[PDB]
Design a binder for this molecule. Structure first.
Ligand SMILES: CCCCCCCCCCCCCCCCCC(=O)OC[C@H](COP(=O)([O-])OCC(O)COP(=O)([O-])OC[C@@H](COC(=O)CCCCCCCCCCCCCCCCC)OC(=O)CCCCCCCCCCCCCCCCC)OC(=O)CCCCCCCCCCCCCCCCC
Ligand SMILES: CCCCCCCCCCCCCCCCCC(=O)OC[C@H](COP(=O)([O-])OCC[N+](C)(C)C)OC(=O)CCCCCCCCCCCCCCCCC
Ligand SMILES: CCCCCCCCCCCCCCCCCC(=O)OC[C@H](COP(=O)([O-])OCC[N+](C)(C)C)OC(=O)CCCCCCCCCCCCCCCCC
Ligand SMILES: CCCCCCCCCCCCCCCCCCCC(=O)O[C@H](COC(=O)CCCCCCCCCCCCCC)COP(=O)(O)OCCN
Ligand code: HEM
Ligand code: HEM
Ligand SMILES: CCCCCCCCCCCCO[C@@H]1O[C@H](CO)[C@@H](O[C@H]2O[C@H](CO)[C@@H](O)[C@H](O)[C@H]2O)[C@H](O)[C@H]1O
Ligand SMILES: CCCCCCCCCCCCO[C@@H]1O[C@H](CO)[C@@H](O[C@H]2O[C@H](CO)[C@@H](O)[C@H](O)[C@H]2O)[C@H](O)[C@H]1O
Lengths: 273, 124, 63, 55, 402, 438, 124
C-alpha cells in the first residue's frame, strides 16, 4: 500500500511538472492553457480569487507567472526524483510483486544480470520510438498554436490541455458546477488511494480472474474514451457521453470492483470444492 | 475479505437449493476459465499470504503439505517465466484441488475475531 | 564508595518542591513561551517571505 | 515494535535524527554540521525564490 | 469430605464457612501410567486448551471475570486440575471441567506452540533446583519403569499428538476421574456433576504396564548449576512408620537463622548445606530419601557420611523424647498436608480412586522407640541402596563409599 | 461468608485478634508489630534485622539449644520477618500446642539474652548476607527502587543496613530499640485457624501482661516522604535477563484512593510467559508483550506505607534489543489510564479484584497475615462486605482522575539491572509518561 | 604508526645514554602538559581502537583490566561533558599509569607482521 500511495503522489507531481513546463514556451496554448487551468483555483470558496492572483503574481497570466513557473518547473523534477526513490525504498520491504500474484520468496533471481539485460531490450525499443518521433515527426504530438506567440487579446479556436491530461479534463467538463468539476477532477486521481480497500479479493491480481479481467478492459477503454472526449468540442452528443463515461470511471472504484471481487471470491471457493 | 466471510457466504448459498442450482454451475465454469489449474496450482495456493494471520496458518501446515506447496509454487513460477502451460500430470485435476489451507486459516481467524470481540466485552 | 544503596549526594541540585504543580508549571511556562515565540516568529517569517509572490510594486502601478 | 522502528521510511529518519546514538560529550564545535544544514535550507528557500524574479 | 457418587463419578465435598471454593478433578493419569515418557505432563498442560464448546481464549477471558484461578500439576500417581473461585460460581466451573474431559480438541498447533513450550519451561524451572533433579534421578534408578518413569516431558523423548490423544482416551473416563470440592456444598456438587459428567465415557481403569520392581544403583547427572545428592532406599513393604522416621531424622530448621535439633540438621553444622528426609508411599512400593544440596561438593560429601551414620545410629537406639518429637512433627506434617489444596485433593483423590482410606492427622499412630529403631535398622541394612549425584559428579560420593 | 474476626484489648493496650476455622487442625498464632527498619536512624540502621537473628539465640530461661528443642517438641515451626514498617513473629502449630507457642513467642520477645558472644557470632552471618542478596535480583531491584525514590529518607534505607553498622551494633542499642518500639500499644497478638479467642486472650493475660506501654499511645498504623524522580542503572552485560522497575509515588494504606489505585493496577495486571493462560489475558499490555515476545514477565504493584506508597511495574526480559519497545508500550498503557479507560476496563478489573482480595486468604498463615497487616495499618479488620462496597464505589472516572494526578506527566523512579544498554536515558523514559496526541 | 614502531624507536632512544638524557625529561614534561591524567585516563586508554588489530588486543585483555578500562572511559566522558577535571583519587598518579595494553597489541602486531612477511617468502 505504501509504495502505491507514494506512487499516486508521484503522478500528481508529474502532472504539475509537465503543466508548468508547457507554459514556458509562452505560445498561444501556453498562455491560454495557463489561464483556464489556473482559473480553476478561483472555485476554492471565499479565498479562491485571492489565491489565483497570488499564484499569477498579478491580475492575469504574465511575466511574473512565467518566471515563477520556470523556477518551479526546474525544482519539481528533483522533488519527483525524491518521491520516486521513496516509493522504491518502501517497495523494498516486500520486494516486487509478480504476474502470478504469489510469493516469490521461494524462487529469487538477482536483479543483475537478469533484469539488467532484460531492461536493455525495452530501453532500445523505447529509443527506437523516441528516434521516430524526434527525428522524423517531431511535432506530431504537439499543437500548432504553440508556434504562435502568446496574445492575451486573441483567444485560440480551442483551448485543450496536452493529450495526457485529456481524461481529467473530460471528467471536469462532465460536472456542470465549477467547484463540483474541480473536485471530481482531483478525486479522479485521489480515488486511486482507495483501491487497497475496495478490492475485496482474497487473491492478488487479475491473471486468474476472468470477470475482473473483462471489467479491467472496460475500465481502460473508458479511460481512453474520456481522453478522446477531452478534445472534442462541447457539443451534442458528446456532452452526455462524457457524463456517462465519468459515471463509469467512478463506479469502477465504488461499485463494480467491490462487487466483482466479492463474487469472484465466492466462485473460487465454491468452484473448487 | 476474510476467508471466514467467504466461507460463510458460500455456505449460505450452498444451503439454499435454488441458489446452489444457479451458483454452483457458474462457479465451476469460472474455475475452468480461471485456468490456475493449467499452471498446476491448487486454488488455495493463490490466496494472499503476506498477512500475520496467513503467515501463522502457513506455519501450521503439516510438513508434507508445506513441502508440496513450495514445489507447486516453484513449478508454477517456472511455467510463468517460460510462458508454458502444465501438461499431463502437472495439470491439477478437479479431484486434486483440495482445500488444504482453509481449515488452518479458519482456525487462525476464529481466534483473532474472538479476541477482537472479547476485547470489547462489557460486564453486565 | 562501595555500597550501591547509598545514593550519591544530589543535595546541591535537588529542589525541595520537586513534586508540586507549581514546580512543573514553571518549566512548562518556559517551554510554552519558547513555543509561543517560535509560532509568532514562524508566522512572521512565512507571511513576510511568501508575500514576495504577491503582485510587486511595478505590477500594482500598472493596474 | 514502535512504528518509528517498524516502518522502513520512518526508521531511516529515526536512525538519523531521533534514536541515532551519539557520544554524550560532544562540545559546541559539533554544532556546525546542523548550522551547515540550516545554511543549505536557507539558500534553497531564498535561492528558489530569487529564481522566480531573476532574469 | 463426604464421599459419594454422581453418574458413575466419585465426588467428595466438604462444606465450609468461606467465600472461596476449590474444585479439583483428580485423574488416575499420573506418570506411573504414562504410555509414553512425559505424556502425563503433556496431558496436564493440555487441560483448558480449546474445547469444542469453548476456546482456551474464551475460557481465560471468562475466568478473569469471575476472578477465578487455575492450578494444574502432575504426580507419579495423578494429574490434578484445580480451580479456585467464589462459592456461587460453582456451576460454571463444573461445566468447564466437563468440557475439558469430554470435548478437548487436541490440535497439533496447540501442542507445538502452546503446550510443549510451557511444559519445557515448567521442567527447566524445576531443574534450577539440583535437589529436584537428584530426587527424580533416584526414582528412576530405584524403579526403572512405572514409578521410575519421568514425571515431566523432556526434549530427548518427544511426545506426539497421537500419544497424547490416546492417553487422554484412556484417562478421560468415568473410571479414572474423581471430583474433590473444598468449601463446596456436597449435595449441590453431586447434582451438578451428575448432569455435567453423565455423557463422559465409562472407559476402564488405567493400569501400570508391569509390576513394580525395585533396583539399587547410582545416577550421575552432570550439571553446572549446583550440587545435590540423594541417598534413597527403595521399600518393598510401605509402612506408616517411615513418615515418623522421615520427620524424626528431619533436616530443615523449625526456626529462623538456626540449624535445628534433628539428627540430619546437626549433620550440616559448619557447612552451608541443607538436608531433607522424605518418605514417598506409592501403595505397592515406597521410597525413603535423604537429599543434600549445597555449593561445595566437599561439604556435601561430608554431610552424606554423617547422614548415613545418623540413620545407623537411629537403628541402634531412639529415646522416648525423640520418639515423641517424631510423633509431634509427623502429626503436624499430616495436618498441613491435608490443609494445602494441592496435596489435599490428591489425598482424597487416592481414597476415591484407589481405596486407601485417608489417615486423619488426629489418627496418626504414635510409634514407640522400638518401632522407630527397627524401621531405621531395615533401611541401614538395605540390599538395594540408590545414590543420585547431581553437579560436579566427580567430587560427589558413590554408593560403595556410603 | 467467613467467620467474624473477634478483637479484644488488654489493659496495657495489647490488641488480641482472632479468626477461628473449625475445619482445620493447625493454628497460626503470632505477634504483629507496628515497627520496622523505618524506626531506626542512620547510625542504628540494621538493628531491627539484627534483633530478628538474636531473638532465636536464647533467652533468660531457655538457651539456644533448649529453644531449638522446645520448638522441635511442639511439632510446628516458628518464623519471623522484618520489613520497613512491620515486624512479625509467628508460630504455626497443632490445635492443642497453641499455649506452648504463645509462651515461646512471649519469651523470645520480652526476655531475650542478647549476649555479647551471640552478637559477635551473628555479626559475621549478617555480613555474609550482604554478599548473597546480590543473587535475588527482584530484591536488589526493589531495594534500589526504595533507596532512590526516597533518597536520604528513612524509607530509603535498606533493612540489613550498611556494613559499618553491622560491625558496631551493640546489645545496648539492640535493647534500646526493642524497648522503645516493641510496646503493647504497637503490638497485635493474632490467632487464625483452630484457636479459641477466649483462650488466646487468657494466654495474652498470662504472658504479655508485663509489656511496657509507650508514653504517647497513638492509634495503630500512624506514621514527610518527598519522592525523588531519579534512576539507578546497574548494568551487567554478563547477565542474560534485564530486570527493570518503574514506579511513581503511590498511595498510603488509608488514602481515599487506595482502592482506585488497586483497580488501576489490575487493569495493567501481571504476565508470565511460563504460565499457559497468560497469552490469553484481557490486559492490553499483556497482549502487546506476549505477541511481540517483549518480556519474560511483568508484575504490576501498588505498595503502601503509612504515609506514602510506590505504584509501578516490575519487568524481566531477555529481549535486549527491544527493551525500548517494552518500556515504551508499558508507559503508553499507563497513559491510557488517564486518556482512554472507560467502564469496559474498570468493571472488568473490579470483577477480578472482588474475588482476588478473598482468594489470597487461603491458609491459616495467610489469614493471620491479613488480620495482622490490617490491624497494624488501619487499626481494624475490614470486613469483606466493606471491601466489596469500597471496590464497587470505584468508577472509570475516579480511575481517570486518579491517573491524571498520579501518573500523567509525573516523575518516575527507575531501576535497571542487567543487560540494559537498550534502556534509554531518563528523559526519553519520562517523556513516555504523557501523550502529545492528548 | 604501529605500536610496534613506536615501541622500537623508543627503545633505541632509551638505550642511547645521551639520547635518553635529553628525551626522557622532555617526554615527562610533555605528558604532564598533555593533561590526560587530569581526566583519570591511563596513556593506553587514548590509543585508537577502531582497527582489527586493536579490537583483537582489547578482546585479549583480562576481564578485570577490561572492566576497569570501561569505567575509566565512562568517567572521562562524564568529566568531558561536564567540563570538569578529576580531583583526588580520580587523578591518575604517575605510578598508576601502567602500559596494560601494550603487551597485547605488540603480540597481535607481531603475528600480523610475521604473516605479511611469510606471505612474501621465496623458496631459495
Ligand atoms: C557562526 C554562527 C554562530 C553560532 C555560534 C557557534 C559557536 C559555538 C562554538 O563552537 O564555540 C563555542 C565554544 C564553547 O564550546 P564548549 O562546548 O563550551 O567548549 C568546547 C571546548 O571544550 C572549549 O575548550 P576548553 O574547555 O579548554 O575551554 C577553553 C576556552 C573556552 O573557555 C570556556 O570556558 C568556554 O577558552 C578560550 O576561549 C581559549 C583561550 C583564549 C584566550 C584568549 O567556545 C570555545 O570553545 C572557544 C575556544 C576556541 C579557540
Ligand atoms: C485495452 C484492454 C486491455 C485488457 C487486458 C486484458 C488481459 C489481456 O489479454 O492482456 C494480456 C496479458 C495477460 O497476462 P496475464 O499475466 O494475465 O496472463 C499470462 C498467461 N497465463 C494466464 C497463462 C498465466 O495481460 C497483461 O499483460 C496486462 C497488463 C496491463 C497493462 C494496461 C495498460 C493500460 C494503461 C491505462 C492506465 C490507466
Ligand atoms: C516552527 C514552528 C513551531 C511551532 C510551535 C507551536 C506550539 C507547539 C509547542 O510549543 O509545542 C509544545 C508541545 C508540548 O511540549 P512537551 O512535549 O514539552 O509537553 C508535553 C507535556 N504536557 C502536554 C503535559 C505539557 O510540543 C509538541 O506538541 C510538539 C510540537 C512542536 C513542533
Ligand atoms: C527553530 C524553532 C525551534 C523549534 C520549534 C519547536 C518548538 C519547541 C517547543 C516544543 C517542545 O519543547 O517540545 C518538544 C518538541 O521538540 C522537538 O521535538 C524538537 C526539538 C528541537 C528541534 C530542533 C532540532 C535541531 C535544530 C537544528 C537544525 C537542524 C539543521 C537542519 C536545518 C517535545 O520533545 P521532547 O522529547 O523534549 O518531549 C518532552 C515530552 N513530550
Ligand atoms: C517517476 C515515476 C516512477 C518511476 C521512475 C518508478 C519506478 C519504479 C520502479 C523501477 C519499480 C520497480 C520495477 C517495476 O515494477 O517496474 C516500481 C515499482 C512500483 N511502482 Fe513505480 N515508478 C514511478 C511512478 C509510479 C507511480 C505513478 C505509481 C503509482 C500510482 C507507482 C507505483 C509503483 C508500485 C506499486 C510498484 C511496485 C510494483 C510491483 O512490483 O508489483 N510508481 N516503480
Ligand atoms: C549552496 C547554496 C547556494 C549558495 C552558496 C549560493 C550562493 C550565491 C551567491 C554568492 C550569489 C551572489 C549573491 C549576491 O551578491 O547578490 C547567489 C546569487 C543567486 N543565487 Fe544562489 N546560492 C546557493 C543556492 C541557490 C539556489 C538553490 C538557487 C536556486 C535558483 C539560487 C539562485 C540564485 C540566484 C537567482 C541568484 C542571483 C540573484 C542574486 O544575486 O541575489 N542559489 N547565490
Ligand atoms: C499556510 C500559510 C498560510 C498562507 C500564508 C499567507 C501568505 C500571505 C499573507 C499576507 C502576506 C501579505 O500580508 C501583508 O504582509 C505584510 C508584511 O509581510 C504587511 O505589511 C506591513 O508590514 C510591512 C513591513 O513588514 C510594511 O511595509 C507595511 O506598511 C505594513 O502594512 C501587511 O499588513 C499584510 O497585509
Ligand atoms: C538526516 C535527515 C533524516 C532523514 C534520514 C537520512 C536519509 C538517509 C537514510 C538512508 C540511509 C540508510 O540508513 C541506514 O538505515 C538503517 C535503518 O534505517 C540504519 O540501521 C540502524 O538502525 C536500525 C534501527 O534504527 C537497526 O536495525 C540497525 O542495527 C542500525 O544499524 C543504518 O545505520 C543507516 O545507515
Amino acid at each position: 500500500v505504501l509504495p502505491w500511495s507514494i506512487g499516486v503522489i508521484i503522478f500528481l507531481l508529474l502532472i504539475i511538472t509537465a503543466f508548468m513546463g508547457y507554459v514556458l514556451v509562452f505560445g498561444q496554448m501556453s498562455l491560454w492553457g495557463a489561464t483556464v487551468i489556473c482559473n480553476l483555483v478561483s472555485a476554492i470558496p471565499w479565498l479562491g480569487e485571492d489565491i489565483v492572483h497570488f499564484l499569477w503574481g498579478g491580475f492575469s497570466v504574465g511575466n511574473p507567472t512565467l518566471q515563477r513557473f520556470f523556477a518551479l518547473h526546474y525544482l519539481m523534477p528533483f522533488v519527483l526524483a525524491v518521491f520516486a526513490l521513496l516509493h522504491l525504498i518502501a517497495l523494498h520491504t516486500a520486494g516486487s510483486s509478480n504476474p502470478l500474484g504469489i510469493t516469490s520468496n521461494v524462487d529469487k533471481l538477482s536483479m543483475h544480470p537478469y533484469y539488467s539485460f532484460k531492461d536493455l531490450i525495452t530501453v532500445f525499443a523505447f529509443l527506437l520510438m523516441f528516434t521516430l518521433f524526434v527525428f522524423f515527426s517531431p511535432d506530431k504530438l504537439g499543437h500548432p498554436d504553440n508556434y504562435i506567440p502568446a496574445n492575451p487579446m486573441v483567444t485560440p479556436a480551442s483551448i485543450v490541455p496536452e493529450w495526457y491530461l485529456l481524461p481529467f479534463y473530460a471528467i471536469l467538463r462532465a460536472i456542470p458546477d465549477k467547484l463540483g468539476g474541480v473536485i471530481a477532477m482531483v478525486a479522479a486521481i485521489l480515488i486511486l488511494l482507495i483501491l487497497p480497500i475496495v478490492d475485496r479479493s482474497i487473491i492478488r491480481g487479475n491473471a486468474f480472474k476472468p470477470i475482473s479481467k473483462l471489467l479491467f478492459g472496460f475500465f481502460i477503454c473508458n479511460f481512453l474514451l474520456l481522453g478522446v472526449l477531452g478534445q472534442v468540442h462541447i457539443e451534442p452528443p458528446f456532452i452526455v457521453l462524457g457524463q456517462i463515461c465519468t459515471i463509469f470511471y467512478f463506479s469502477y472504484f465504488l461499485i463494480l470492483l467491490p462487487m466483482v471481487s466479492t463474487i469472484e471470491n465466492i466462485f473460487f471457493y465454491i468452484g473448487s470444492l | 475479505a476474510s476467508i471466514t466471510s467467504v466461507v460463510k457466504t458460500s455456505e449460505l448459498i450452498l444451503k439454499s437449493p435454488l441458489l446452489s442450482k444457479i451458483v454452483v454451475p457458474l462457479a465451476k465454469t469460472y474455475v475452468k476459465f480461471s485456468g490456475y489449474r493449467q499452471l498446476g496450482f491448487k486454488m488455495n495456493d493463490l490466496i494472499i499470504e503476506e498477512t500475520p494471520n496467513m503467515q501463522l496458518a502457513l506455519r501450521r501446515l503439516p510438513p508434507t503439505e508445506s513441502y508440496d506447496r513450495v514445489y507447486r509454487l516453484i513449478r508454477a513460477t517456472q511455467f510463468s517465466l517460460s510462458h508454458k502451460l502444465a501438461t499431463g500430470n502437472d495439470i491439477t485435476k478437479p479431484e486434486e484441488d483440495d482445500h488444504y489451507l482453509i481449515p488452518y486459516i479458519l482456525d487462525v481467524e476464529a481466534e483473532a475475531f474472538e479476541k477482537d470481540a472479547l476485547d470489547n466485552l462489557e460486564v453486565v | 564508595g562501595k555500597s550501591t544503596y547509598k545514593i550519591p549526594d544530589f543535595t546541591p541540585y535537588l529542589k525541595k518542591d520537586r513534586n508540586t504543580d507549581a514546580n512543573r508549571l514553571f518549566s512548562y511556562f518556559m517551554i510554552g513561551s519558547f513555543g509561543m515565540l517560535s509560532a509568532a516568529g514562524a508566522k512572521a517569517t512565512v507571511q513576510d517571505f511568501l508575500s514576495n509572490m504577491s503582485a510587486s510594486a511595478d505590477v500594482l502601478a500598472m493596474a | 515494535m514502535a512504528l518509528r522502528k517498524k516502518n522502513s521510511l520512518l526508521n531511516m529518519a529515526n536512525s538519523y535524527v531521533l534514536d541515532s546514538p551519539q557520544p554524550s560529550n560532544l562540545n559546541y564545535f559539533w554544532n556546525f554540521g546542523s548550522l551547515l544544514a540550516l545554511c543549505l535550507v536557507i539558500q534553497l528557500a531564498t535561492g528558489i525564490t530569487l529564481a522566480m524574479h531573476y532574469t | 469430605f463426604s464421599t459419594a457418587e454422581a453418574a458413575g463419578v466419585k465426588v467428595a465435598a466438604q462444606d465450609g464457612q468461606s467465600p472461596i471454593s476449590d474444585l479439583s478433578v483428580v485423574l488416575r493419569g499420573g506418570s506411573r501410567y504414562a504410555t509414553v515418557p512425559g505424556v502425563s505432563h503433556i496431558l496436564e498442560k493440555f487441560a483448558f486448551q480449546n474445547t469444542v464448546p469453548k476456546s482456551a481464549l474464551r475460557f481465560v477471558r471468562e475466568l478473569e471475570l469471575f476472578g477465578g484461578k487455575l492450578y494444574t500439576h502432575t504426580t507419579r500417581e495423578h494429574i490434578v486440575l484445580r480451580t479456585q473461585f467464589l462459592k456461587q460460581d460453582l456451576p460454571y466451573f463444573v461445566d468447564a471441567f466437563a468440557n475439558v474431559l469430554k470435548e478437548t480438541k487436541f490440535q497439533q498447533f496447540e501442542l507445538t506452540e502452546r503446550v510443549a513450550p510451557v511444559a519445557e519451561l515448567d521442567l527447566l524451572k524445576r531443574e534450577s533446583d539440583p535437589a529436584f533433579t537428584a530426587l527424580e534421578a533416584a526414582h528412576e534408578v530405584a524403579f526403572r519403569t512405572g514409578l521410575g518413569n519421568s514425571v515431566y516431558a523432556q526434549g530427548y523423548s518427544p511426545v506426539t499428538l497421537e500419544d497424547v490423544k490416546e492417553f487422554a482416551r484412556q484417562v478421560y473416563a468415568k473410571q479414572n476421574v474423581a471430583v474433590v470440592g473444598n468449601n463446596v456444598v456436597p449435595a449441590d456438587l453431586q447434582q451438578l456433576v451428575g448432569t455435567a459428567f453423565a455423557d463422559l465415557q465409562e472407559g476402564s481403569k488405567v493400569t501400570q504396564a508391569g509390576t513394580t520392581t525395585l533396583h539399587g544403583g547410582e545416577a550421575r547427572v552432570r550439571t553446572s548449576t549446583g550440587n545435590a545428592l540423594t541417598i534413597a532406599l527403595p521399600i518393598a513393604e510401605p509402612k506408616p512408620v517411615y513418615h515418623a522416621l522421615a520427620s524424626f531424622l528431619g533436616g530443615p530448621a523449625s526456626m529462623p537463622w538456626s540449624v535445628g535439633a534433628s539428627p540430619l540438621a546437626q549433620a550440616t553444622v559448619g557447612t552451608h548445606t541443607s538436608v531433607k528426609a522424605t518418605y514417598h508411599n506409592y501403595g505397592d512400593a515406597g521410597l525413603f530419601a535423604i537429599t543434600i544440596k549445597g555449593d561445595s561438593p566437599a561439604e556435601i560429601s561430608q554431610v552424606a557420611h554423617k547422614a548415613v551414620q545418623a540413620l545407623k545410629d537411629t537403628g541402634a537406639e531412639v529415646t522416648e523424647e525423640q520418639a515423641a518429637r517424631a510423633y509431634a512433627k509427623s502429626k503436624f506434617a499430616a495436618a498441613e498436608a491435608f490443609e494445602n489444596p494441592d496435596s489435599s485433593a490428591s489425598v482424597i483423590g487416592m481414597e476415591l480412586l484407589s481405596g486407601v482410606s485417608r489417615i486423619a492427622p488426629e489418627n496418626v499412630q504414635k510409634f514407640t522407640p522400638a518401632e522407630l529403631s527397627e524401621a531405621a535398622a531395615q533401611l541401614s541394612a538395605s540390599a538395594k541402596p540408590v545414590v543420585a549425584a547431581v553437579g560436579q559428579v566427580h567430587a560427589l560420593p558413590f554408593a560403595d563409599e556410603l | 461468608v467467613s467467620p467474624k474476626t473477634r478483637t479484644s484489648n488488654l489493659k496495657n493496650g495489647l490488641t488480641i485478634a482472632s479468626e477461628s476455622n473449625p475445619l482445620v487442625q493447625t493454628a497460626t498464632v503470632g505477634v504483629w508489630i507496628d515497627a520496622g527498619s523505618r524506626n531506626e536512624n542512620a547510625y542504628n540502621n540494621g538493628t531491627a534485622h539484627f534483633f530478628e537473628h538474636l531473638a532465636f539465640k536464647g533467652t533468660d530461661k531457655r538457651s539456644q539449644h533448649q529453644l531449638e528443642l522446645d520448638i522441635e517438641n511442639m511439632g510446628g515451626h516458628l518464623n519471623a520477618y522484618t520489613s520497613r514498617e512491620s515486624t512479625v513473629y509467628y508460630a504455626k502449630s497443632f490445635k492443642d500446642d497453641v499455649p506452648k507457642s504463645v509462651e515461646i513467642l512471649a519469651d523470645i520477645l520480652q526476655h531475650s539474652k542478647l549476649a555479647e558472644s551471640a552478637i559477635d557470632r551473628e555479626r559475621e552471618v549478617i555480613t555474609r548476607e550482604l554478599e548473597e542478596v546480590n543473587k535475588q535480583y527482584e530484591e536488589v531491584v526493589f531495594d534500589h527502587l526504595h533507596a532512590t525514590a526516597f533518597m536520604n529518607q528513612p524509607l530509603g534505607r535498606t533493612i540489613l543496613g550498611p556494613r559499618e553498622n553491622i560491625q558496631t551494633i551493640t546489645n545496648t542499642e539492640l535493647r534500646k530499640f526493642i524497648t522503645e518500639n516493641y510496646t503493647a500499644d504497637r503490638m497485635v497478638l493474632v490467632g487464625a485457624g483452630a484457636v479459641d479467642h477466649d483462650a488466646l486472650v487468657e494466654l495474652a493475660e498470662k504472658y504479655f501482661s508485663h509489656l511496657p506501654s509507650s508514653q504517647s499511645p497513638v492509634p495503630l498504623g500512624t506514621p514527610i516522604p518527598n519522592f525523588v524522580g531519579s534512576e539507578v542503572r546497574l548494568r551487567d552485560d554478563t547477565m542474560p535477563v534485564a530486570h527493570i522497575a518503574i514506579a511513581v509515588e503511590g498511595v498510603s494504606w488509608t488514602s481515599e484512593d487506595y482502592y482506585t489505585a488497586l483497580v488501576a493496577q489490575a487493569i495493567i495486571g501481571n504476565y508470565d510467559r511460563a504460565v499457559g493462560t497468560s497469552r490469553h489475558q484481557g490486559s492490553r499490555l499483556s497482549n502487546i508483550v506476549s505477541e511481540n515476545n517483549l518480556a519474560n514477565s511483568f508484575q504490576s504493584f501498588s505498595t503502601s506505607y503509612s504515609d506514602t506508597g510506590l505504584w509501578g511495574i516490575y519487568l524481566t526480559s531477555e529481549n535486549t534489543t527491544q527493551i525500548d519497545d517494552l518500556v515504551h508500550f508499558t508507559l503508553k498503557e499507563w497513559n491510557r489510564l488517564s486518556t482512554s479507560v472507560s467502564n469496559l476496563q474498570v468493571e472488568r478489573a473490579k470483577s477480578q479484584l472482588k474475588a482476588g482480595l478473598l482468594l489470597s486468604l487461603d491458609g491459616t498463615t495467610y489469614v493471620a497475615e491479613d488480620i495482622g497487616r490490617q490491624l497494624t495499618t488501619l487499626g481494624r479488620r475490614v470486613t469483606p462486605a466493606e471491601v466489596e462496597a469500597k471496590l464497587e464505589a470505584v468508577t472509570e472516572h475516579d480511575v481517570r482522575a486518579w491517573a491524571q494526578k498520579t501518573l500523567y506527566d509525573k516523575d518516575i523512579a527507575l531501576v535497571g539491572l542487567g543487560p540494559i544498554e537498550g534502556l534509554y536515558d531518563y528523559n526519553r523514559i519520562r517523556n513516555d509518561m504523557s501523550m502529545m496526541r492528548w
